[PDB]
Every structure is written in structure tokens, then in C-alpha cells.
Motif scaffolding. Structure first.
Motif, PDB file in Angstrom:
ATOM      1  N   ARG A  45       0.830  -1.189   0.000  1.00  0.00           N
ATOM      2  CA  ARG A  45       0.000   0.000   0.000  1.00  0.00           C
ATOM      3  C   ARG A  45       0.877   1.257   0.000  1.00  0.00           C
ATOM      4  O   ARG A  45       0.645   2.180  -0.783  1.00  0.00           O
ATOM      5  N   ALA A  46       1.860   1.253   0.888  1.00  0.00           N
ATOM      6  CA  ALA A  46       2.770   2.382   0.998  1.00  0.00           C
ATOM      7  C   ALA A  46       3.790   2.320  -0.141  1.00  0.00           C
ATOM      8  O   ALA A  46       4.210   3.358  -0.658  1.00  0.00           O
ATOM      9  N   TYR A  47       4.160   1.100  -0.500  1.00  0.00           N
ATOM     10  CA  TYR A  47       5.123   0.896  -1.571  1.00  0.00           C
ATOM     11  C   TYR A  47       4.633  -0.178  -2.546  1.00  0.00           C
ATOM     12  O   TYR A  47       3.659  -0.875  -2.271  1.00  0.00           O
ATOM     13  N   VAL A  48       5.333  -0.274  -3.667  1.00  0.00           N
ATOM     14  CA  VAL A  48       4.985  -1.248  -4.686  1.00  0.00           C
ATOM     15  C   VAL A  48       6.238  -2.016  -5.101  1.00  0.00           C
ATOM     16  O   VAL A  48       7.173  -1.439  -5.657  1.00  0.00           O
ATOM     17  N   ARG A  49       6.225  -3.311  -4.819  1.00  0.00           N
ATOM     18  CA  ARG A  49       7.349  -4.166  -5.156  1.00  0.00           C
ATOM     19  C   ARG A  49       6.928  -5.214  -6.187  1.00  0.00           C
ATOM     20  O   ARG A  49       5.778  -5.648  -6.206  1.00  0.00           O
ATOM     21  N   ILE A  50       7.883  -5.591  -7.021  1.00  0.00           N
ATOM     22  CA  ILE A  50       7.628  -6.577  -8.056  1.00  0.00           C
ATOM     23  C   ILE A  50       8.790  -7.572  -8.107  1.00  0.00           C
ATOM     24  O   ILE A  50       9.882  -7.279  -7.622  1.00  0.00           O
TER      25      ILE A  50
END
Length: 102
Positions: A45-50
């Protein structure tokens, strides 16, 4: 006796960026657009990781541009946290990869 390490060539990518909005249904839709039938997304939510095999390619620059038409490419380079590999952009597209030497 001799310390040695190695980890070059296709392996896996891990782009770390911040979260904006609608990045959930956007990332998912941006994943279907690509033959990434083996990728793991970790959007808290705070960050986006892939996480991919190491090779990725996106062309939904229109979706990313639309999400914020009233902006520029600067915000992109600004709207980031970290990365596991390298990133590249084409005429009107963006690709990701953890490959060093090409």
C-alpha cells in the motif's frame, strides 16, 4: 581461502517503488499485457514491489501517463524507492531487467 562471488546474467528482478493509486488494478493489468506468466507482485500500500524472472517489458506508458497526465518523466525518476536491476525506456515504453552486460 579465496573469497569469490558471482551473480550475472538473467536471474530475477526486484523493482522497488512507492505507491500511488490504482496501481493495484494497473499493475495487474500491466502484467496481463505482458507474457509474465511467472511473476510475483508485492503491493502492500505504501510501496509497490515486483519480482520477475529477470526480464520484463512494459508499453502501457499511456496508462502510467494517464494516471497522471498532468506530470512529466521527472516525477517517475522521483517516484521511486529502490531497485534490484536496471530500467530502460524506449520511444514510448519502459522495460525492466536485472541483466548487467548486454
Amino acid at each position: 581461502s579465496t573469497l569469490a562471488d558471482q551473480a550475472l546474467h538473467n536471474n530475477n528482478v526486484g523493482p522497488i517503488i512507492r505507491a500511488g493509486d490504482l496501481v493495484e488494478p494497473v499493475i495487474e493489468t500491466a502484467e496481463i499485457d505482458n507474457p509474465g506468466k511467472e511473476i510475483t507482485v508485492e503491493d502492500r500500500r505504501a510501496y509497490v514491489r515486483i519480482a520477475a524472472e529477470g526480464e520484463l517489458i512494459l508499453t502501457r506508458k499511456t496508462l502510467e501517463e494517464q494516471l497522471g497526465r498532468p506530470f512529466n518523466m521527472q516525477e517517475l525518476e522521483i517516484n521511486l524507492a529502490s531497485f534490484a536491476g536496471q530500467i530502460q525506456a524506449d520511444e514510448d515504453q519502459i522495460r525492466f531487467y536485472f541483466d548487467k552486460t548486454m
